[PDB]
RNA sequence: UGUGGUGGCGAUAGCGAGAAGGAUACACCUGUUCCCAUGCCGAACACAGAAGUUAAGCUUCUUAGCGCCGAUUGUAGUGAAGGGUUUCCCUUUGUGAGAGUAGGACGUCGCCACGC
RNA sequence: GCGGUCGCCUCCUAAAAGGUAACGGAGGCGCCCAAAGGUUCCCUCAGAAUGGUUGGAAAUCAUUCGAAGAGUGUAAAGGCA
RNA sequence: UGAUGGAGGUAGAGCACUGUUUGGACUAGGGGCCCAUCGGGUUACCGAAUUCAGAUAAACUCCGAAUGCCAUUCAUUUAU
């Protein structure tokens, strides 16, 4: 079921974070508001495609 | 309404007569009316509560809830979180108007005419006086109701012993046998 | 024909400094699993219920009436 | 009263087939005939067949010539033959 | 191979115990009783034999009191099996008795038949006994 | 039915507030006390246990009844008596209550009249 | 000095039982228009008021029925010396519990305000 | 030799700091949850007795007694009102 | 070595918790069966509501020792 996953900054285009999900409870892609170390500002992060 | 007027006029000084109360605050009032359509068959088909709520909304002036389960019973096919029954509380002045409907209309429209059974004691001022049918009230539609289940009424007073509640219900209609 | 012979390692709990010491900042005092002794003055709790000393000083032990005990640090 | 999710009610004055008690309230409705000032200015149409005096738990023993339809359905056709 | 009395399990194998001394634990039901004044294990079957040697002198009356019960269990391996592997299957139900404690008690029968039945009992138990009354109380009644 | 008391619940709420911070060394408490007809307040240090300044509703100078306005007057009195003894950064007790009325009436009247939160 | 608020100290502070009170204060009670609220219900929660009642809560006083705190003394257990069977027991020397009790005990200390 | 076992976590053996072996005595693990996480508010359980239509020892109710006899994703300890 | 404060649940007691248990009082009510084809439920065992007395535990505890262990701007002797 579960999958080790990585996040993607939607502005600076980097692979920043790493976390988990359960791919039958969450069919669509994750979106959380996290902190980007490159831009030093809170930025939306999507799942890496 | 009628029944606060009876408390102000006749009920309270007759209570001070028949129990020798030293102050008016000692007099027992009435608090609640609790109603419970205990269906227990929405687990089989869920469209059984779907008309029990329709009947309770007409009978009361409120809507009922839907009750949870707290257990998991194998015999009746029960788990946690199961829709079973439906409470209706009553407070304020809708206590007394519903009691007016109970004293006047309802209680004399039941076959095997006897009124009120005198043993509902519980020692502490609570007469759960259940209802067998559903067709008793004036607002009941033969073209809508099918099942022949019934109601619950939990009369709740602040009286200590049941000698007091008998005299209160004697001074509030309530045709005991 | 035995299905036993399994253990965990020993993980070495217990108080790691006595009373009356001179105790530097941020050192462990009484490692627990499960809160057996609550903290008092200048003592905090980590993730696995251990007990520090925030300020430099002297560890002394107390008790909360009847049930459970306290650790507190007085500078000085 | 929580808003919008409670049923319909108007303080409807009672009546009766016999002697017409006019004091009370109600919830259901109809075509209003006697909006009455001495009571709630509402419907009269709750017109119950029962006085709670007509039943012999309050007034006394009054059913010998009780003369009600289905009662007379036997007790008029041979009821003239009875008496 | 007659076992009268057992337990309900909750643990199969138990550690072989270590008994040193006791005291008190006097007559209170019941009027005439033994005292085991050494210390040993006492099995099931000895208490059967003690029962029957009691009751065949207790004809039409007189109470029998059994105050000791086999809680613990021994184990034993086979013959031909070496040392080695796990503890063998438990066979038997045996309870320890130290000094001081009282094996059995009698009441309702005069003294002579009492001492008859008690010496019939104590030749079937591996402990040196005595015979003691309910001697003195604050109220004997 | 036992009618339940209405200070046992308030003091259970005090006990589950006062675990975190009283902390009244020189940044003391405030207080908020409902009744049916009054509003009281105190400024308390620990571990002296000794108050510093206070005011109350129907004792001294009133405006209305069980109003917010009386509470604003009380907050004016508390903040003016406090700053005559050099106190800046008091800590609220919530008491056992909420912030809807009769309480924020004390609070934001006490803020503007000298105090700091 | 009464009452209310508010703190520490191991329930010796408690639980049960009984009596008394409304100067102020507290509380019950009246009601919902308004801030606000009920998975339904002004029961609470929130806000307006003040006809009355000390019945309840609260406060004061009595009480050793349940619970709490209990000395001294006797014994089991045991460090260090020793002696016999060696499974176990006994003797000198140091330390002593757990039970079972005489007994203590129906609180103590601190601050602010109001009324008197 | 044939059997069984090989890493990790709990309890006992373990001699009241910690540590301590046996093919000694008992059980689990190779995950799960986008909320079962963070904060801010509010709340108190299992049972028993007595009455009440379907309704039955055991559903929804109502009053009273009830320091825990409950719950804590999962084995066992230590905690938590 | 002496003085002082503290951590802990061994020995022994081991009842209040959970397991194992022995006799007496009792019905709320069960009996193969009754008095039967409405009340006495003859006798019977009595578990639970209970409640007296009496025992037991390595994986039971309301309690609880000598001793060892860790510490000290402490004291005496010693020299690590
Ligand atoms: Zn970026």
DSSP string, F20-69: T----SSS-B---EE-SS-EEEEEE-TTT--EEEEEETTTS--SSSSSHH
Alpha-carbon Rg of chain B, whole angstroms? Answer: 18
Q: Is F85 near strand G, with its CB below 7 A from some atom of it?
A: no
Task: With CA atoms as reference, report the closest residue to F87 among F70, F59, F110.
Answer: F110
Q: Could you tell me if D27 lies within 8 Å of chain B, comparing CB atoms?
A: yes
Question: Could you tell me which residues are beta bridge partners of residue C58?
Answer: C74
Contact B1, B96 (CB under 8 A): yes
Task: With CA atoms as reference, report the closest residue to C37 among C62, C5, C54, C11.
Answer: C62
- What element of type H or E holds B36? strand B30-36
Question: Could you tell me which residues are beta bridge partners of residue B32?
Answer: B156
Task: With CA atoms as reference, report the closest residue to B40 among B28, B31, B52, B32.
Answer: B52
CA neighbours closer than 13 Å in the CB half-sphere of residue D66:
11
Closest residue to H13 (CA, C1′): E15
* Residues sharing a CB contact under 8 Å with residue C5, sequence separation 6 or more, in sequence order: none
- What element of type H or E holds F9? helix F8-15
Q: How many CB atoms lie within 10 A of CB B3?
A: 19
The residues after which chain B has a C–N gap greater than 2.5 Å are: none
Calculate ∠ Cα B14-B16-B18, nearest 5°. 65
Which nucleotides on chain H have any atom < 7 A from a protein Cβ? 3-6, 8-13, 17-20, 22-28, 31-35, 41-43, 46-47, 50-65, 77-80
Contact B100, B131 (CB under 8 A): no
Encode D11-37: b = buried (16+ Cβ within 10 Å), e = exposed.
Answer: ebbbbbeeeeeeebbbbbeeeeeeeee
CA distances from F94 to F41, F91, F99, F101 (A): 12, 10, 8, 12
Dmax (CA) of chain D: 64
SS3 B87: strand
Going by their DSSP bridges, the two strands B154-157 and B126-128 should be labelled as antiparallel
Q: What is the DSSP letter of F72?
A: H
CA distances from E85 to B22, C75, E16, E135 (A): 85, 59, 17, 53
Q: Which two tokens stand for residue B13?
A: 């000084």
DSSP string, A1-49: -EEEEEEEETTT-----EEEEETTT--SPPEEEEEETTTTEEEEEEE--
Q: Is cis: bond before F47, omega within 30 of 0? A: yes
Question: Could you tell me which residues are beta bridge partners of residue E90?
Answer: E75
- Residue reference for tokens 């030749």: E123
Contact B133, B139 (CB under 8 A): no
Calpha distance C27→C56 (Å, rounded): 9
- What element of type H or E holds E141? none
Touching chains, A (3+ CB pairs < 8 A): none
Q: Which two tokens stand for residue E74?
A: 């021994």
SS3 B154: strand
* Main-chain dihedrals φ then ψ at residue E33, nearest 5 degrees: -150, 160
Alpha-carbon Rg of chain E, whole angstroms? Answer: 18
Residue A36 annotated as part of some ligand binding site:
yes
Alpha-carbon Rg of chain F, whole angstroms? Answer: 14
Question: Could you tell me which residues are beta bridge partners of residue E104?
Answer: E66
CB pairs < 8 Å spanning B and F: 3
Calpha distance B79→B87 (Å, rounded): 20
Mutate to test the interface with B, among D9, D25, D42 (most CBs of B within 10 A): D25
Contact B85, B93 (CB under 8 A): no
Say whether E85 and C2 touch across the interface (CB within 8 A): yes
Task: With CA atoms as reference, report the closest residue to C39 among C69, C9, C74.
Answer: C69
* Residues sharing a CB contact under 8 Å with residue F27, sequence separation 6 or more, in sequence order: F89, F90, F91
Calpha distance D39→D13 (Å, rounded): 7
Tell how far CA B123 is from the center of its chain: 18
Tell me the residues surrounding ligand 1 (ion) with CB < 5 Å: A 9, 11-12, 36, 38-39, 43
* Residues sharing a CB contact under 8 Å with residue C12, sequence separation 6 or more, in sequence order: C31
Contact B149, B69 (CB under 8 A): no
Is E88 inside a domain boundary? yes
3-state secondary structure C13-69: CEECCCCCCCECCCCCCEECCCCCEEECCCCCECCCCCECCCCCEEEEEEECCCCCE
Burial (Cβ within 10 Å: 0-12, 13-18, ≥19) of residue C58: middle
Question: Distance between the two ends of chain B, CA-based, in angstroms?
Answer: 27
Which nucleotides on chain I have any atom < 7 A from a protein Cβ? 5-8, 12-13, 19-23, 53-56, 58-59, 70-73
- What element of type H or E holds B59? helix B49-59
Calculate ∠ Cα E52-E56-E62, nearest 5°. 100
Q: What is the DSSP letter of D36?
A: -
Q: Total structural domains in chain E? A: 1
Calpha distance E11→C6 (Å, rounded): 19
Å separating the CA of residue A14 from the C1' of nucleotide G94:
78
Task: With CA atoms as reference, report the closest residue to E17 among E47, E41, E43, E42.
Answer: E41
Which nucleotides on chain G have any atom < 7 A from a protein Cβ? 4-8, 10-11, 25-29, 32, 35-50, 52-58, 75-77, 88-89, 110-115
DSSP string, E89-111: PB---BEEE-SS---EEEESS-H
Contacts of C2 in chain E (CB under 8 A): 85-86
SS3 E31: coil
> Helices F104-112 and F68-83: crossing angle, nearest 10°?
40
Q: Which two tokens stand for residue C73?
A: 């640090």
Tell how far CA B164 is from the center of its chain: 19
Task: With CA atoms as reference, report the closest residue to B18 among B170, B174, B176, B177.
Answer: B170
Calpha distance E92→B65 (Å, rounded): 62
Technique behind the model = cryo-EM
Q: Dihedral of CA A12/A17/A18/A24: which sign?
A: negative
Q: How many CB atoms lie within 10 A of CB E8?
A: 4
Q: What is the DSSP letter of E43?
A: -
Q: Is E18 near strand H, with its CB below 7 A from some atom of it?
A: no
How many residues are recorded in chain F? 117
Å separating the CA of residue D38 from the C1' of nucleotide H42:
47
CA distances from F70 to B9, F42, F61 (A): 40, 16, 9
CA of D30 to the centre of ligand 1 (A): 69
CA distances from B27 to A12, B21, D48, D70, F51 (A): 77, 8, 34, 49, 44
- Spell out the domain ranges in chain A: 1-49
Contact A16, A3 (CB under 8 A): no
Contact B27, B34 (CB under 8 A): no
Calpha distance F73→F95 (Å, rounded): 19
- What element of type H or E holds E42? strand E40-42
Alpha-carbon Rg of chain A, whole angstroms? Answer: 11
Burial (Cβ within 10 Å: 0-12, 13-18, ≥19) of residue F39: buried
Q: Which two tokens stand for residue F71?
A: 């509470």
Q: How many CB atoms lie within 10 A of CB B66?
A: 15
Is E125 inside a domain boundary? yes
* Residues sharing a CB contact under 8 Å with residue E39, sequence separation 6 or more, in sequence order: E19, E20, E21, E96, E97, E98, E99, E127
Q: Which two tokens stand for residue E89?
A: 């299957």
Contact D48, D12 (CB under 8 A): no
SS3 F77: helix
- Residue reference for tokens 């308030």: F10
Nearest nucleotide by C1' position to the C49 CA atom: H79
Å separating the CA of residue E70 from the C1' of nucleotide H21:
32
Task: With CA atoms as reference, report the closest residue to B1 among D25, D52, D37, D26.
Answer: D25
Calpha distance F13→E139 (Å, rounded): 58
Is E10 inside a domain boundary? no
Tell how far CA B132 is from the center of its chain: 12
- What element of type H or E holds E33? strand E32-34
Number of H helices, E strands in chain D: 2, 0
Task: With CA atoms as reference, report the closest residue to B136 among B164, B108, B155, B160.
Answer: B108
Torsion from C-alpha of F76, F77, F80, F86, nearest 10 degrees: -120
Going by their DSSP bridges, the two strands E40-42 and E32-34 should be labelled as unpaired
- Spell out the domain ranges in chain B: 1-177
Resolution (A): 3.5
Domains in chain C (CATH in brackets) are 14-74 (2.40.50.100)
Contact B103, D52 (CB under 8 A): yes
- What element of type H or E holds C74? strand C69-74
Tell how far CA C39 is from the center of its chain: 8
Q: Which two tokens stand for residue B40?
A: 């227990």
CA of A3 to the centre of ligand 1 (A): 24
Å separating the CA of residue B20 from the C1' of nucleotide G63:
30
Calpha distance D7→C66 (Å, rounded): 58
Domain that holds residue E34: 23-141
């Amino acid at each position: 079921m579960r999958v080790n996953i990585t996040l993607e900054c939607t502005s600076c285009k980097e692979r920043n974070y790493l976390t988990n999900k359960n791919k039958r409870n969450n069919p669509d892609r994750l979106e959380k508001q996290k902190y980007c170390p490159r831009e030093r500002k809170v930025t939306l992060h999507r799942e890496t495609k | 309404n009628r029944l606060k007027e009876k408390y102000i006029k006749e009920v309270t000084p007759s209570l001070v007569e028949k129990f020798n109360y030293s102050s008016v605050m000692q007099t027992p009032k009435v608090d609640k009316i609790v109603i419970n359509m205990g269906v227990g068959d929405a687990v089989s088909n869920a469209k059984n509560l779907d008309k029990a709520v329709e009947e309770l909304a007409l009978i009361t002036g409120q809507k009922p809830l839907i009750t949870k389960a707290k257990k998991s019973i194998a015999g009746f096919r029960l788990r946690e979180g199961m829709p079973i029954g439906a409470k209706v509380t009553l407070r304020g002045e809708r206590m007394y108007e519903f009691l007016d409907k109970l004293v006047t209309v309802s209680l004399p429209r039941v076959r095997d005419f006897h009124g009120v059974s005198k043993k509902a004691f519980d020692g502490r001022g609570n007469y759960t006086l259940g209802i067998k049918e559903q067709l008793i009230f004036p607002e009941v539609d033969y073209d809508l109701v099918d099942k022949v289940r019934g109601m619950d009424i939990v009369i709740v007073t602040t009286a200590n012993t049941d000698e007091e509640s008998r005299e209160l219900l004697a001074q509030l209609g309530m045709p005991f046998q | 024909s035995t299905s036993n012979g399994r253990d965990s390692e020993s993980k070495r709990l217990g108080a790691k400094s006595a009373d009356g010491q001179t105790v530097t900042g941020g050192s462990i005092l009484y490692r627990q699993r499960g809160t057996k002794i609550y903290p008092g003055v200048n003592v905090g709790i980590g993730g696995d219920d251990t007990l520090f000393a925030k300020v430099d000083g002297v560890v002394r032990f107390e008790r909360k009436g009847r049930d459970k005990k306290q650790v507190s640090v007085y500078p000085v | 009263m929580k808003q919008d999710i409670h049923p319909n009610y108007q303080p409807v004055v009672f009546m009766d087939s016999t002697t017409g008690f006019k004091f009370l309230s109600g919830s259901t409705k109809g075509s209003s005939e006697t909006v009455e000032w001495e009571d709630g200015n509402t419907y009269p149409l709750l017109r119950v067949e029962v006085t709670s005096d007509s039943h012999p738990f309050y007034t006394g023993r009054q059913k010998f010539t009780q003369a009600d339809g289905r009662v007379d359905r036997f007790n008029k056709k041979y009821g003239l033959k009875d008496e | 191979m007659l076992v009268p009395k057992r337990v309900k399990h909750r643990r199969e194998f138990r550690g072989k115990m270590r008994g040193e001394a006791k005291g008190g634990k006097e007559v209170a039901f019941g009027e005439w009783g033994l005292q085991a004044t050494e210390s040993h294990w006492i099995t099931n079957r000895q208490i059967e034999a003690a029962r029957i040697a009691m009751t065949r002198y207790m004809k039409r009356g007189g109470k029998v009191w059994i105050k000791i019960f086999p809680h613990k269990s021994y184990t034993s391996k086979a013959i031909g099996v070496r040392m080695g592997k796990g503890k063998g299957a438990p066979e038997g139900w045996v309870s320890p008795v130290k000094r001081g404690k009282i094996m059995f008690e009698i009441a309702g029968v005069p003294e002579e038949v009492a001492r008859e039945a008690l010496r019939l009992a104590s030749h079937k138990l591996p402990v040196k006994t005595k015979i003691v009354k309910r001697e003195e109380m604050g109220g004997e009644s | 039915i036992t009618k339940p008391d209405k200070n046992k619940t308030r003091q259970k709420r005090h006990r589950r507030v006062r675990n975190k911070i009283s902390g009244t060394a020189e940044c003391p408490r405030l207080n908020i006390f409902r009744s049916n007809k009054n509003i009281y307040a105190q400024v308390i240090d620990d571990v002296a246990g000794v108050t510093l300044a206070s005011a109350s509703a129907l004792d001294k100078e009133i405006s209305g009844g069980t109003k917010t306005e009386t509470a604003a007057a009380v907050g004016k009195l508390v903040a003016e008596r406090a700053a005559e003894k050099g106190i800046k950064k008091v800590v609220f007790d919530r008491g056992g209550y909420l912030y809807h009325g009769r309480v924020q009436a004390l609070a934001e009247a006490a803020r503007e009249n000298g105090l700091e939160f």
